[PDB]
Homo-oligomer: A and B are copies of this chain.
C-alpha cells in the first residue's frame, strides 16, 4: 500500500544511489526507481543501459522496480497512484537546492518528498565526478556496482 519514487538520471547508478534504494525499499511497500531522461541531451548511457545496470544491482530487492520517464516528476509519481518522493542528501548545499524543488512539487501536485542522509562512505561520490575521474584514468572501482564499472570503462574507450 505504501510506496515511493526514487528519481534521478542514474548515468550511471552509483553505490550511493544503491544505498538509498535499499533504505527506501526497507521502509516502503513498493519503490519505483525513476530514470528521468532529457530528450534534448544524451547522457553517457542510453536509457536501456541505465535500467539494465540498476536492475542487475538491485536483484536482491523484490519490492523495487525500475521505469524511465521524462517531463514533470510529480506527473510520473501521481500516474502511479503514489504521493511520495525519496531522495538522498549529502550536504547542506544539496539540501537547499532539493528543498526548493520539494516545495515546488508539493505546491503544484501535493506530492511529498522524504530525504535520507548519505552513508558516510559515499558522501563524496556522484555520477558526474565518477565519470570525470574515470575519463582521466582514476580508479573508481570501489564507488560503483559491478554492473557499472567495466561498462563505464568500455564507453570511455
Residues of chain A at the chain B interface (Cβ within 8 Å): 1-2, 4, 23, 26-29, 71-72, 74-75, 83-84, 86, 89-93, 95-104, 106-109, 112-117, 119-126, 129, 133, 136-140, 142-143
* Residues of chain B with a CB closer than 8 A to A100's CB: 90-91, 123-124, 126, 129
Establish whether residues B117 and A103, one from each chain, have CB atoms under 8 Å apart when the complex forms: yes
Check A121/B124 contact, CB under 8 A, given A100-B129, A108-B139, A109-B138: no
Residue of B nearest to A108 (CB): B138
* Residues of chain B with a CB closer than 8 A to A27's CB: 2, 4, 28, 83-84, 112, 114
| Copies held by the complex | 6
Chain A binding surface SS class: mixed
- Cα separation A101 to B129 with both chains bound (whole Å): 8
Of all A-B residue pairs in the complex, the 10 with the closest CB atoms, nearest first, are: A92-B92, A103-B124, A72-B136, A114-B114, A95-B95, A102-B117, A108-B138, A115-B115, A100-B124, A91-B96
